[PDB]
Structure formats: C-alpha cells, structure tokens
Amino acid sequence: ILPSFIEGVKESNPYNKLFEERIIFLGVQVDDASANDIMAQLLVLESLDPDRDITMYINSPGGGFTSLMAIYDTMQYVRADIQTVCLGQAASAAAVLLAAGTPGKRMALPNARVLIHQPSLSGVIQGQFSDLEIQAAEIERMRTLMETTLARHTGKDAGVIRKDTDRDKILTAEEAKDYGIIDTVLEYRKLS
Amino acid sequence: ILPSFIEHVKESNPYNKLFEERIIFLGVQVDDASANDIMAQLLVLESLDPDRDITMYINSPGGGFTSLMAIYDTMQYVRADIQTVCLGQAASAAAVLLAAGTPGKRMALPNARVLIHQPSLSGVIQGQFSDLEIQAAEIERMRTLMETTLARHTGKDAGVIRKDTDRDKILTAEEAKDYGIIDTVLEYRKLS
Amino acid sequence: ILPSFIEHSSFGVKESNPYNKLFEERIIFLGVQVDDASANDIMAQLLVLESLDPDRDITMYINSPGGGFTSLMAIYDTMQYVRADIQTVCLGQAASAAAVLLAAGTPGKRMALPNARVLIHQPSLSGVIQGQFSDLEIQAAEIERMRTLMETTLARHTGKDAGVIRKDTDRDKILTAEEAKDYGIIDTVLEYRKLS
Amino acid sequence: ILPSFIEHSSFGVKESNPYNKLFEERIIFLGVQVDDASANDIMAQLLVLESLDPDRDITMYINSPGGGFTSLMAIYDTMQYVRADIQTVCLGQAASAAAVLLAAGTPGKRMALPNARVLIHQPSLSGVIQGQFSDLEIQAAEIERMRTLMETTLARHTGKDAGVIRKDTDRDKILTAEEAKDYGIIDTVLEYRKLS
Amino acid sequence: ILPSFIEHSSFGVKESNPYNKLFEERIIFLGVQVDDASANDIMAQLLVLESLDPDRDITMYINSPGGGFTSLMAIYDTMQYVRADIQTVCLGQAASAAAVLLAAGTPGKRMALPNARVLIHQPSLSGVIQGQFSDLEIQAAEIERMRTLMETTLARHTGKDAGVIRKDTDRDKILTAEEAKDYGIIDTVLEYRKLS
Amino acid sequence: ILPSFIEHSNPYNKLFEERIIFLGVQVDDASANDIMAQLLVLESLDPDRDITMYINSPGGGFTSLMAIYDTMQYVRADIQTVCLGQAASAAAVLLAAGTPGKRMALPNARVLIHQPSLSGVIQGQFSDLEIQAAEIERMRTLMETTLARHTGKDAGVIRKDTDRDKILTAEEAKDYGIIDTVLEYRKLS
Amino acid sequence: RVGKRGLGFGAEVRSHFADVMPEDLIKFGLIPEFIGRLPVVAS
Amino acid sequence: SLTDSVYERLLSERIIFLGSEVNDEIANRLCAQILLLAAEDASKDISLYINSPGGSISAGMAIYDTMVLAPCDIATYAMGMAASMGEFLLAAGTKGKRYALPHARILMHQPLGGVTGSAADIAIQAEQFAVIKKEMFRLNAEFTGQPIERIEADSDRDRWFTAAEALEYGFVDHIITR
Amino acid sequence: SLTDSVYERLLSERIIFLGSEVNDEIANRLCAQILLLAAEDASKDISLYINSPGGSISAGMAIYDTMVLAPCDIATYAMGMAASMGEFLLAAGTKGKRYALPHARILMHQPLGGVTGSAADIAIQAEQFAVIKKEMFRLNAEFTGQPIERIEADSDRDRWFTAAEALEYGFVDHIITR
Amino acid sequence: SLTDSVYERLLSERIIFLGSEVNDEIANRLCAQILLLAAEDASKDISLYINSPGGSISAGMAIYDTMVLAPCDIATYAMGMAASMGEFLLAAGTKGKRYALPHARILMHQPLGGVTGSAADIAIQAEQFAVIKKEMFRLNAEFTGQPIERIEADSDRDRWFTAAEALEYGFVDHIITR
Numbered sequence A: 001i002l003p004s005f006i007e008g009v010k011e012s013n014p015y016n017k018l019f020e021e022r023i024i025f026l027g028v029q030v031d032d033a034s035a036n037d038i039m040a041q042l043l044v045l046e047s048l049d050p051d052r053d054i055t056m057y058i059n060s061p062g063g064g065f066t067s068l069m070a071i072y073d074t075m076q077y078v079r080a081d082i083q084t085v086c087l088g089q090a091a092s093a094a095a096v097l098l099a100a101g102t103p104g105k106r107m108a109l110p111n112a113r114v115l116i117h118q119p120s121l122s123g124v125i126q127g128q129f130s131d132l133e134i135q136a137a138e139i140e141r142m143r144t145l146m147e148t149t150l151a152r153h154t155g156k157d158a159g160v161i162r163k164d165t166d167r168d169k170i171l172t173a174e175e176a177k178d179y180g181i182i183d184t185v186l187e188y189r190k191l192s
Numbered sequence B: 001i002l003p004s005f006i007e008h009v010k011e012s013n014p015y016n017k018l019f020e021e022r023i024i025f026l027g028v029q030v031d032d033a034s035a036n037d038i039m040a041q042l043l044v045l046e047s048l049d050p051d052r053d054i055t056m057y058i059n060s061p062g063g064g065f066t067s068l069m070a071i072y073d074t075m076q077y078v079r080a081d082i083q084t085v086c087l088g089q090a091a092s093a094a095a096v097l098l099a100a101g102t103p104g105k106r107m108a109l110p111n112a113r114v115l116i117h118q119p120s121l122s123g124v125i126q127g128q129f130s131d132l133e134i135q136a137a138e139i140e141r142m143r144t145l146m147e148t149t150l151a152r153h154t155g156k157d158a159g160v161i162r163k164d165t166d167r168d169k170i171l172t173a174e175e176a177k178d179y180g181i182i183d184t185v186l187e188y189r190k191l192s
Numbered sequence C, D, E: 001i002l003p004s005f006i007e008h009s010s011f012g013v014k015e016s017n018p019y020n021k022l023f024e025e026r027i028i029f030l031g032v033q034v035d036d037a038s039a040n041d042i043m044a045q046l047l048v049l050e051s052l053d054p055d056r057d058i059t060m061y062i063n064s065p066g067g068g069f070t071s072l073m074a075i076y077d078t079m080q081y082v083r084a085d086i087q088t089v090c091l092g093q094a095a096s097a098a099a100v101l102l103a104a105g106t107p108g109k110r111m112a113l114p115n116a117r118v119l120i121h122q123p124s125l126s127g128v129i130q131g132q133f134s135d136l137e138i139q140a141a142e143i144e145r146m147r148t149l150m151e152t153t154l155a156r157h158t159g160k161d162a163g164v165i166r167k168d169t170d171r172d173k174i175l176t177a178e179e180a181k182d183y184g185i186i187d188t189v190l191e192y193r194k195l196s
Numbered sequence F: 001i002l003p004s005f006i007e008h009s010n011p012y013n014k015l016f017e018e019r020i021i022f023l024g025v026q027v028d029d030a031s032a033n034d035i036m037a038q039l040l041v042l043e044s045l046d047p048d049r050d051i052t053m054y055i056n057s058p059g060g061g062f063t064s065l066m067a068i069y070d071t072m073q074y075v076r077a078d079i080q081t082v083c084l085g086q087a088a089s090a091a092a093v094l095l096a097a098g099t100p101g102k103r104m105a106l107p108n109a110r111v112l113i114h115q116p117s118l119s120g121v122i123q124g125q126f127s128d129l130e131i132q133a134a135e136i137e138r139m140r141t142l143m144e145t146t147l148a149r150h151t152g153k154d155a156g157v158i159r160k161d162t163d164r165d166k167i168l169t170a171e172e173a174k175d176y177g178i179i180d181t182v183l184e185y186r187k188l189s
Numbered sequence G: 001r002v003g004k005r006g007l008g009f010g011a012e013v014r015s016h017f018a019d020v021m022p023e024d025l026i027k028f029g030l031i032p033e034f035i036g037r038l039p040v041v042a043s
Numbered sequence H, I, J: 001s002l003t004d005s006v007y008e009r010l011l012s013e014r015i016i017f018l019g020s021e022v023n024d025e026i027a028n029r030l031c032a033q034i035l036l037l038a039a040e041d042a043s044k045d046i047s048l049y050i051n052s053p054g055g056s057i058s059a060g061m062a063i064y065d066t067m068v069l070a071p072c073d074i075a076t077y078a079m080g081m082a083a084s085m086g087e088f089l090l091a092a093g094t095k096g097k098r099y100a101l102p103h104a105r106i107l108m109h110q111p112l113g114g115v116t117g118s119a120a121d122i123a124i125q126a127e128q129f130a131v132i133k134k135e136m137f138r139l140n141a142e143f144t145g146q147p148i149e150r151i152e153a154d155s156d157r158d159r160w161f162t163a164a165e166a167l168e169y170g171f172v173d174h175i176i177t178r
Ligand SMILES: CC(C)C[C@H](NC(=O)[C@H](Cc1ccccc1)NC(=O)c1cnccn1)B(O)O
Pocket: A029, A030, A061, A062, A063, A064, A065, A066, A068, A091, A092, A093, A117, A118, A119, A120, A121, A122, A138, A139, A142, A146
C-alpha cells in the first residue's frame, strides 16, 4: 500500500523522496538482495555528494552475516558519515548496522527496540564432522567478528559483548543508548 | 479493482489523490512492509508541510508490535498533528495507532470497530527455558509498553488498560469515544 | 483480459481501460469480494468522487459475493458519509455484505438488473476460531454484535423491522430483483433500454 | 503469445494489443470462463461501448467454457440493457453459460463459425455445498431457480418452450453451428469469406 | 528472455518485441499449446491482420504440441474465414490440433521446414471425465463427433478420404516434412534460403 | 538483477540490436519461439549481416531443438554460434548448426552431446509405445545426421560418441567439429 | 485511412500521397486551419 | 488388542459401545453385535453405551433397525455425548430402558449433508433430504413423545440437552444415579 | 480383531455382511464367504446383510454370480442402505428371501463411470457402457419384476426407495417387522 | 503387543491408565474398563493412574460418570501430568483416594473450544459453552471443595499446581511418599 505518483519521467513514490534526501531505507530483512540494494544506494549517495550525511533507517529483523558485513563494510567505506536511525526494531544483524553509524549520529525512536544476539545457523547444516568442524569454526568466527564489530562501535570489550549476546538481549532505546548502540534517543518533534 | 485517472502526464490512483491531500492510509495489517510504507509517508508529508496536519485512515486488523511502535513513534515524531480516522476496524496495533492521533483529532466512522487486546505470539516460539524467559520478558515488555501507550492516549490508568485488554475488548465507535481511543464519532455528511 | 481504448477528450490520445472510464463517470465498481483490500479501494474512490463533485451522484455497481463485516461497514460508513448520493446498481449477485451495500444506497437510487440476485444472510465466521471459552464468549458476543448491526442496518434501508430481518436472514434469503424491490433492498428493477 | 507494442509519447505508457484494436471496432471478447472477474470486465466494456455510440452494434465474441450463473446473468443483463444491438459470434465453443450469452444477442445478429459447438446444459454446483438440510433446501431451491431462469432465458431467445429447454438440457446438449441455428441459439452459421 | 527493441515512431517512442515486429509483417506464431487463451490470441491476430490488408497473405508459424479441439476449431474457422490467405509454416512440430492448423493453410501455401515433425492423432480426453453412463455416452458421442470432424477437416485439406484419415490417426501417425507433403498436410518442404 | 540504460534499453536489447540472439535458457517451446522470432526479425532487418547466437543452454526438447535448428538454417543471414559456458544436449546441436567458420566457443565452455531421451515415462499400450520408440529413434538418427553434416563426421561415429554423455571441452569440440575456433581472449593486458 | 477496412467477423473488408486528405494531415500534426489555407496538394 | 479384549469381555456381558461417529463401519459392527447377541440370548437385554458425536443417518438407521428387530430389549445409555445419530439411537432404545448418565449431553439437530452435481441431481437430493428429515423427525417425535412440530422447531439448529433436560424432553427414561 | 471376531461368529451362523462399497476386495471376500458357506452346508440359507453405498459393477457381478451359483439360498437384507450395487445384490437375493429392514433405503440408479483416453478407446468404453447398462437394467428388471423400460426411466438419475416403496417396486420381498 | 500385555496384566490388578489426551477413544476404553472391573468385583477399588494433558469434556464426562456410577471406589493417581480433563478426572476420584505422585503437575483451566458457522449457530455454541463451563466449574468446585468463584477466577487462564499445591487446593487427598 504505497502512493506512487507515476510519471516518460521519474515515478516518485515516498521511498524516492527518502532517497533524494539521502535516506537509505533498511526495513526488510538483511538477506543478500537487500544488502545488495543498500550497498548500491550507499555508493550512489556517496557519488552524489560524499560530504553530506547518508541517513540509514533501520526497521529490520536482521538477517545473514555476510549480507550484514556487506552493508557494514559499505557503510564504513563511504566518505559520507552514516546516520543510523532505528525504527521499531534493529534486531540481529540490524543492531550491528545500527551501531555502525557515525558516532554522534546513531539515533533511535523512543519505542524502538534493539535486539542483539549471537549468530545462528538457519536450519541444520549437514555433513561429515570435518565439514562441521569448518562450519563451526566459521560461526565462531562470525560470532567473534560480530563481537569485535560491536566492540568498536559500542565502546565495550568484546568479552562483554560475548556475555551479553549469549542470549537474545533486547534493549529499548534508552537501554541501547546506555549500551552504546545508539547515541541519542529521538525526542518527539510534534508542535502539539 | 482500483482505477486511475490522468492528471496534469501523471497517472494517479485514488491512493495518490488521498496522499496529496495529506491522507496516509493504513489499510492492511501492521507488518514491517506496511509500517515502512507509513513511516515513509509520514516523513514525506511532514517535509511538505509540517504545520498542515496529516490524516491517517485506519482500516486494519493490527499486526506486529515493532512495526506498531515504528508507526507509533513516527506519528508522535512528526511536527504535523495526526488525524486518525477509523474505517471499519482498528484492531490491536491499529487501535493503538487509532488512539495515537492528536487529541481532538481522533475520529471513527459510526460503524467502525475498535478491538484492543494484549500482544500475542503467532504460533509457538521454540527454545530453551533461558530463551523462553527472555521471549516472555519481551512479551511482557510489549504488553506493558502497549498498556502504557494506551494510557498516554486514552487518559486511562495502565492498570485499567491491562484489565480491559485481558481479552478482546471490542469497542464500537461510541464505546471507543467513551473509552478514550477516539475523540469524535464521525457523523455522516450526506446532503439527503 | 481487459482491452484498453483511447479517448479523444479535451486532450485526446488518452489511453483508458473501461474501469477508469467508469470512475470518470463517477461509477465505483464493487465486483470483487468485500474484503479489506477491496473496501480500502472503494472508500478511497468514494472520497475522491466526493471531492471531485459532492453534488453529483456516485454510482456503485455491485457484483460482489459479499465478505468481511468490518470491510462491509467500512464501505457502508463511507457511502453514508459522503455528500454525494450513492446510486447502487446490482449486476449479477449482491450477496452477504454486498446486499447490505446494495440497500445502503440513497432511497430512490437503489437499482438491480432484472436477473440480478440479492442474497441476504446472517454473519458467519469463516472457519473455526478457537480459544478458551472466555475468548469464545467474546467472539460470539461479537458476531451477535455483527448480526444485530447488520439487521439494524438493513432495517434502516429496507423499512422493515430488525426482527423481520432476523427472521428472514436466518437462512440464505435469496431475493430476485423484483423480490428485493418488494423487500426494500432496491426500489428499481431497471428495465432494459435496448432500442430493438 | 500476443504481439503488442508500447507507444510512450511522454503522455502515457500506451499499450496496443489486438484486443485493443478489436475493442475500438466495438468487439467485446468473451474468451475466458464466465466468472465474476470476466463478467466484471465484459459489463464494463458493454457500458463503455454503449456510451461511445449507443447506436452502433456491439459485437461479442464468445469462445468460452461458461461459468457462474450470477456472472452469467451479470453479462446477460448488461447485454440486454444497452441501447446497442449485440452481435454475438461463437468461436470454437459456447458452453454452459456462454451459450446463453450466445443466444442473448440481438435476433438476426447471433452468429457462429461453422465448426463452433454450442453446449447447453442445466446449472450445476461445482463441488459440494455442505450444510444442514434447511441450508441445502435453500441451496436446492436456488439451483432450481437458476435452472428455471436459464431455461426461460433460453426460451425467450430460441423461441422454444421452457419445458423443451428442460428436456434438452437434462444432459449436455452439444449442438454444432448448424444445429444451434435450427435450435435457435444462433441465427447465422457464418460463411467463410476467403479470397481464394 | 525476450529483447523489446525501441523504434522511433510518430507517437513519441514505440517499444516493440520481436513478435510485434513480425506481426507488422503478417506473421503469426502458433508457438504455444493450442488452448483457449492461445486460440483467443490467434483469432484476434487473424482478424486484425485481415482488416489492415485482406489481400496480403498472413504467415502462421506453427511450433505447437496442439491442444483443445474447440480452441483448434476456433483458430481453424478464423483461418478459413479471413479474406487473407494463410501461409502455415511448421517449425519443429505441429502435433494434434496444430497439424490440423498446419493443413488449414491456403493450398499451395502450407510449408514445413525440413526437420519439422507433423504429428496427427485422434482427439483424446485429457484426464478422466466422470459421470453417469448417460453423461458418458454424451461425452463419447462428442469425442466421436470431434474425431469425425477432425478427420473430415483433414479430408478436405489433405485431399484424402476421411476413412483414410481414420486408419492413419488410430495411433500417432508421425510425419516428417517430406512425409507430410506426400500426405497432404503441407504443400512444400520449405527449402533453406540461406545465402551461403 | 539486470540494470538498463535507456536510449543508448537493457543489455539484451543492446545485444539484439547488434544482431546477437541469446540462448541461455533451456531449449523448450517457449525459448524456441523466442529465438525463431528473433531469427526472423534479424533476417528482415538485414539478411546480409551475420546473426550471432550465444549458447549458454543446458539443452532441451528435440522438436524445440529442430525448430531453432531449421530457422537458423532457414534465414538468409549466416548464424555465428558462440558457446558460453555450456552447450549441452540439444544446444550443442545448435552450436554445431552455425555457419562453418563461424562457430566459436569460449575456452572454458563445455560442449555436451548425448542421444535424445524421453523425460519421464510415456505410458501407453505397446502399439502406442512402438510408435514412441520408433519416434525416439527417428529423433536419435536425425540428431546424429544433423551432427554428421555439421561436424564432418560419419553419423555412425556420432552414434558411438553419443552413446553416453560425450562432454567435450572447447578444444575437444574444435577437434570434433562442433565449433570451428576456440575464441581467444582479447584482453589488452 | 486508405485501407481502413471493417474489423472482425461482421462488416465487410471491401467497404501514396495522391490519396491525401486533411484527415490524414490532422493525424500528422498539421492543424486544420493550416491545411485549409493550403488548397493545392502537389505530390 | 487390549481395547478389543475389554470390548470382547463386555460383549460377553451383552454390553456394546457406540463410541465413535456412526459411519458404516461402526454401524455394521454394532449391527453384527446386536445380531450376535440376539442369537445367543433372545431374552437378555443388550446394553448399548453411547458416546457418539452422531454420524450417518443410514448407518444409524441400520443400527436402529437392528435394535428394533432384535427380539431382546436394547437398553441405551447416554455416556458423555449422545449427539445427532447418537441421540437418535439413544432415544431409539427400548422405552423404560433409555438411560442418560447424569453428565451426558444430548444434541438433537436436523440432518446435515451436501448438495452436489447438476440441478436435476440436486432436485433429487433435496427431495430425498426432505424424506430423510421428515423420517428422522417422525422417529424422534415417536421416541421422545414430542410432537413432530416440536421436533422440527427444536432440531432446526443445534439443541443441547443435559441429562435432566433430555429426561423431560423424552430421549431417555431414567437418569442413573448410583 | 474384535470386528473380525464378531463377523467370524456370524459367518458361523451363515450371516455375512456387505457393509462397505462393493470394490474387488469386499467382493472377493464375500465370494469367498459364499463359497465357504456353500461348501459347509449346501442347504442352509446364507443371510447377506447389506449396508452398502454401491460399488463396482464387476465386483458386484462377482458377488451376484457367487450368490446364484451357490446351491443354498442367499437371503438378502437391506440394512440401512442398499444403494447402487447394494440394491442390485439386495434384489439379487433368492426370491421370497429378499428383505428390507423397515428404515433401510434403496437407491437405484444407472451406472457411473469415466471415459478417458483416445477417441477410439472411448468409443469402445461407450460401447461397453451400453452393454453394462443394458445388462444391469435387464437384471434389475428381472429381479424386481419391473419392465426394463421402467428400470431404464427410473434409474436415469438417483431414484430413492423407502422399505415400503422397495417392496412395491420389487427389490425386496418382505419388510421385517418383529 | 507388549504395551497391551502390561496394561492387561494391570487391568487384572484393577489398575487402569488415563495416559493420553481424553478423546472419545481413550474415554470409551476407560469406561469399558471401569464397567469391566466393576462387573468383576464391585468392592475392590480401581486405581486410575492419570498422565493426561486433558482432552474432550464430553469424553471425560463419560469417564467421570462411569467412575461415579461404578459401585467400587476409583482411586485416582496424578502421575506426572493431570491437565484440563486429566485434573478433572483426578479430582473426580473417590474422596480420600485421590492421590498425586509427588512430582506430578496439575493444570486447571477453563474449557477450550471453537466457534464456527453462522451467527445463530455460534449463539447456540456460546450458550452451550456457558453451560459446559458452569458445569465444569461446579464440579471442580465440588471436587476440590473450593468456591465456584474461586474455580472461575483460577481457571480463567492456565493455573498450574504442584503436588503440594494440588493437595492444598483440593484436587488430591494425599501425596504418595513411599
Ligand atoms: C546475529 C547476526 C550477526 C545475524 C543473525 N543471524 C545470523 O547470524 C545468520 C542467520 C540468519 C538469520 C536470519 C536470516 C538469514 C540468516 N547467519 C548467517 O547468515 C550465516 C550464514 N552462513 C553460515 C553461518 N551463518 B540475525 O539474522 O538473526
């Protein structure tokens, strides 16, 4: 349900009116295809002006780890400071992208929850024990890489991230400010 | 079927013609993709005029809580007053968004349904008991936050919201005005 | 399949499908089941056509098998809200919610076609809604709220008592157009106007 | 596959089917099963073509297995309504409901191609309608009203007694094009007009 | 994937696939299975190509497994109806109905490329038609009517007796291009016009 | 995802207006009718310029094969078949079906030739199956005589080679006769 | 326009620059005022 | 099986169970058990314990005919649930010997079915549905001693009975309270 | 099993059950039971209780042939439902020994089937459908004593019978009222 | 079977098991076992070991009626789980003879069900749901000795009991500690 203003000219739905104002939107899960979309937008907005801040909106349930680090690297790569805003939820990989914003520019709405958790395998990976030794050293590497990523951005020790992401830690907006994932909780701006 | 009509080059459906008149339409269940649509529309219409109010039509069976609080916080964030009109039903999150409008500006059609209930889980969330006591502290966080949210807006005590949302408290438009979810049962303007 | 024609209007070379052309002549079309997604469409069209001209009549064509009650009362309230009189025409069936929307038109302006079918019946739960008996006591007081509200609605528009609607909508009361004219769902069977 | 270009002209994304070409020459095309969505399309086109010119004849091409009865009587009433005469042409088949629409053309203007078949039979219920015996007595008085209405429709368009339609549509009565001319469904088995 | 190339036309810009580029040259593809929607498309193309010039020959390229008998006779009668001569060219296969449409071209103008298969067989019921024995004797007299009509159709196009078609189509009489020329379905095994 | 570039159009439009027909899907009736539409368009645009056919196909149906095969041989234009990755089963016959001297393959392209198969089981009476088995021998013999006239090998040599899956490389398909040159890389570095 | 036959199973299909009319030139884009000021057509 | 062994030992004590829906399989084995027990002793009563959600009319009419044509009395026992065909066969017991256990529930309603096929087939089905419903209401009026118009009005939708309400209405003759 | 044990004890009393649809499995065990019971005593009657929705013609023709070729009389009993092949085998019983229990229903209709395959196959199927339907109507005319034109017209769609209507029509010889 | 053999040997020792959900199949075999054991000895107690997640009300009311109408005492034993109908039948045992094994859990809650059909059907279902829930709460109030308002408030959602909590509440009379 979305009003598209169609037209041989630009279509201009509200997501175009987000993107022209340098707001990249991450509201779907972080799979490959969404990560591919975000990185294409992060580079385009860098090329349009590398000095104006890119804003990233995060209403994502999270998703895959390599798709996470695809977005993460591109957020960290571009010359523009990334302003991350949490909408509703920033769970799983999307909490890492929320912490991946520029310091001072990591925002959350007051009733947005931030869910941090260790990586999990989607389903069961079968195989020989030498295959599974590789897959388990992999998710331990994914776990360690997620912790040291959240260590860089929350200012905490990676062992503290390890103890806290042992289970699902759901933070509120104020609890994610105290943790270090966001920097400011957005106050309501309504004139009423 | 949804027709269109060509304005002037551009092809607009009635949803475009609603949206150009500052009317955001919540007509599906509140999932991530619908909440992402509504938040994009709330920010576009605030940028177009932050003093001209935004009208939100709610014909919705409700849905996800983080998608709820994503719409909710964006409705509370924007400088424009939100005029929520209930159309047929506002169930669950949709009733919280119905109550989330600006005081004095929360409307419902006379045969609209307002259904409030506590949050649930769709199906069974598996896990260890340490996982489940966190998912249950989460659904209690979601229940308390919803009852707090209906306490800001209906003017009622959150303990009275808790006793009323024990089961489906289904309100008519007149019963939702006495409750505090809407402010005006919107009377018919038929000339005949 | 729907062929699309071209209209040479004040502009000309304007491609139009028959449904855009109905809407241009202020004809809202309810041909699908009355669910939320359909009711969302019709209410958007009722408010656009009220805004384009609140004095000209909106025509509503009804070929619907009927559907959801809140989607019914979403369309119903918007038909009653707008300043424009609603001309409901039944084309084929108006069943369940649709016959209520057929009766919801402006008095004098409710039509059917001579072989149109008007099917009124009480609300039903589609499938089994389960839960505790306190949950089911709520859901059953709710479908009695829906049943009473449907009969109160059909009492306002047919001129019959709501208890008479309750006895008639015990089972599927299928009316023809002449039987729905005598009942009060419509008041014009709309004779054919073919020149031959 | 259907060959169709999109001219743009910076005014539209303008589509051009061969069906758009047929509809410009006032040919409505019933080539799918008569369901609600088909009937909704056909009625919208009959009313557009009545508004474009109510004097020129609408042509209705019928290659259809036939479907729902209320979708049938939706199309049937809109055919009989419009001021334009309707030239029904049978393509390949007109079965069940589509043979009723084939007979519903203007007399003298009901055509069939020589190897088209016309399949008339009584209404059915696709699948089982469950319910209490009071519900089923309603649903069976309905299917008899549908059967009687189809027969009296085929009575007034074929010039047969409605009881003759009963004894003929007791089973599938497949007519050829020439057998449907003798029966009264069509008026002209359409001759080939090839140059060679 | 199918590339839709752009032609700078009068109306702003025209965007055309290879099928519409060939449809501008009186070229029709029966390339899908002959069902209703295929037959509906081909009949719309054959009429549009007749009205643009009824004296310029239509080429119908046939690569089809064949299909429904009424969809067959819908295309068949329309091929025989139109003033323009039909040049049927078989590509790869013309099986079942498609071999009848291959034989349905204008005499002297029915081609097949050298490695095209031509498969003729009697009509079959896909799936099982259930019913009472009075229902089935109707369905069996109908497929005998379909079988006789197809053998009668292949009689006047191949120049054979319909009994000779009946012994041949008892099983899958599969013909090559040269075997279908001796049979009479095509008139010319179409030689390759490659300039090297 | 396929990024476009309008009025310079996606990359398949740009290949087609440079007379490159693309076969990358399996050879079925839908893909055959697409290719034969494109072969007849590019013949009608100019019959004296070469049509290039790219083949990344796993192959498919025989009558869809010989539909494409005949139309490739039918058009006035010379067909330049390039193998891209794979030309399996039916698509290796189309790869051999290019104009002689104009059949390329990329150096790591696979060329897989095998005898025709019936996908699944065709049921029926033994007289139905005697027809269907004389037909798959018609298809087998026609495929081998098709590969005989395009590879220069005897049709009995094709028959012994296509007993099982004869996978050829690019260089092995050049020595076999399916392609005429293995296409050298022309990168400037 | 020259060659505008009837379409379909109904009406009959028997009903350069020398067959030119202003109906063609209005479809071209010449306004009908411009054409009537050009009475003579050379081809 | 154990479950068959307990039922076999209660078949020896002339105690049979209608414990499922009345389909043709459960009906034929009950008809077989009534024919077997009436062949053993034609003078000792058969106890038919009924815990049934109802079932097929013709299956229950097979049981009801085998109950009536048995020379021995069929004592019926509403055990938990005697719904639809199960209330029918409960009320079909020998009068004076129809029992409800005190927390059994009796559900009397009109027959359910389905119409399908052509309009000439459905006109026959409805004609036969009127025959079945008139005959089912005639026998429930005969069993309970209620008027047939009382049975018609009450069976129009689901009408539930407690044991005490079924005793007053006429489905059972006693409420067992031991 | 218990259900097999009751049927075995009624097989000892020469009481067999057609209680399902007449498929080849139920037909072959009934044919086996008739061959078994006629081997034990060739002079004691076999009681065939029929609660059947009908079934395959050739399966019921196997039963009907085994009933006729049995040297002992086959008393048939319409128990609840004798539909299609079940009314046939009911009416196929020994005359004087065809019984309807008083609330059994008898459904006589023409054979159902399915046409499939090529047009030459379906012409053979229809030729054989005309042979089966003429033979099924000839035997129902022979059983009931009705004219074959009466059986043709009445079996054209579903024709339902009560026990008293089946007695008048000729399917059964008595209505058991004990 | 072995599992049936152990249950048969415990049926000989008058020990029966409610070990599944209380559907009509498990209820009818328990009712059959209680009728079988009360026919053998009317004075020796039946031990009903209950490991049940609950089930159908009318199925458990069949068991509860067969428990009460049995002339012998039904000693009930909460074994692991007595939820819904399983706590009911646990508390339905003979007073003084209702036992919880010390790590059994008792789940008392209001009945679950489903509404479906037309609004006139659902009004009947809700009317009967109010009858079932009032009767189920009346008996749990009678069993436990709690007020019916206490049972109404506590059964509103799932209320879990340990063995010691069920002893205080009134479902069982003893906690077995051997
Ligand atoms: C914890 C952060 C890093 C990501 C979370 N899950 C993972 O770690 C994800 C699991 C996931 C969850 C939802 C959708 C897709 C994939 N892990 C992976 O992507 C992954 C992939 N291959 C091997 C090992 N892990 B999140 O998606 O719940």
